[PDB]
Amino acid sequence: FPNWEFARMIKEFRATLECHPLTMTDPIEEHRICVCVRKRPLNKQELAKKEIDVISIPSKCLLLVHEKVDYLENQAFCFDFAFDETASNEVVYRFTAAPLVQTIFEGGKATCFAYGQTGSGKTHTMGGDLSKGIYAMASADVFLLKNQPCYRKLGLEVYVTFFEIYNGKLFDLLNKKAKLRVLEDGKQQVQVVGLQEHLVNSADDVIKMIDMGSACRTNSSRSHACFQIILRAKGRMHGKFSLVDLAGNERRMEGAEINKSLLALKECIRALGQNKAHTPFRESKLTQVLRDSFIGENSRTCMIATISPGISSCEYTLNTLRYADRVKEL
Ligand SMILES: Nc1ncnc2c1ncn2[C@@H]1O[C@H](COP(=O)(O)OP(=O)(O)O)[C@@H](O)[C@H]1O
Ligand SMILES: [Mg+2]
Question: Taking the domains of the chain in order of start, what are their residue ranges?
Fold first, then answer.
């Protein structure tokens, strides 16, 4: 009843729109830079306040934003994958993090980020509803891949880390929120001093670590959480996957550290894209710690831009989409 016949126009547009959504049998794609969008459904509180759903997904790659002016104006965005409200964590995982698990076994570096406004679904995507969770699904597949004959030969051990970044400070979530320190040497290599890697022999051990870690993390909407899977051959690093649940991108309080951090990340992803010798890693603790993952022939990244579909979040949604749009730009 409040926001005009805008809801009626949106419904009429949806009834005419013939859709071609993503399914689980669609072939997995191999991208150096994979940029996705994930729309979460309206919650019970949003449905109670009569929030209009202003997002449609007519294909595996296309996202539409419905704007009132006062007549319907539809804005289109194109991504590698667009996940609608029917997409489970399992479906999202398949097309994002899952193809990057093999990368770490070939001796590469992989990164996976969940980016978007607070309440959009980043933690739900990475950690789980409480149901997995990209961290758990990646961990499970790491242990399946290392039990295979090809890789069982390599003599690989699996280590894990889990830390958060808040106000330019790193805290170890597996070692009682200890304030670690990030150092850079004369060759631009970065080390997190005091960060202990934990040896794990099963995905069940990792789940206990994530749960141990998630219990620590607190507002958790103002911090980045980074979970790492590290493959070591004989103590020598073979491969690394870093999975990050970023701080909310929406904007007295502080959001200047977050915004510079997110801007720095975009530039680092963009630079990996262009196979550049230098990227502005130093501009944030997040990019400094992940420096190693934005360089190399066999370094790959995925970003999942999570969006809240309600009319009230429209401006924040457009900011998220505009940012994700500039992440994979030649
Ligand atoms: N795709 C989804 N399907 C169902 N519920 C979701 C989905 N994404 C998010 N939610 C729910 O919405 C709420 C907020 O999500 P959350 O992951 O905490 O957001 P964020 O980390 O981006 O701030 C939670 O109760 C969560 O389970
Ligand atoms: Mg969260």
Answer: 1-330
> Is beta strand 72-78 parallel, antiparallel or unpaired with respect to 81-83?
unpaired
Annotated ligand binding at 127? The verdict is no
Ligand nearest to the Cα of 121, by number = 1
Rounded to the nearest angstrom, the distance between the alpha carbon of 219 and the centre of ligand 1 is 15
CA distance 250 to 106: 37
CATH 3.90.1150.10 at 1-330, yes or no: no
**Residues at Cβ < 5 Å from ligand 2 ion:** 122-123
Q: Which residues line ligand 1 (CB under 6 A)?
A: 40-41, 116, 118-124, 129, 221, 248, 306
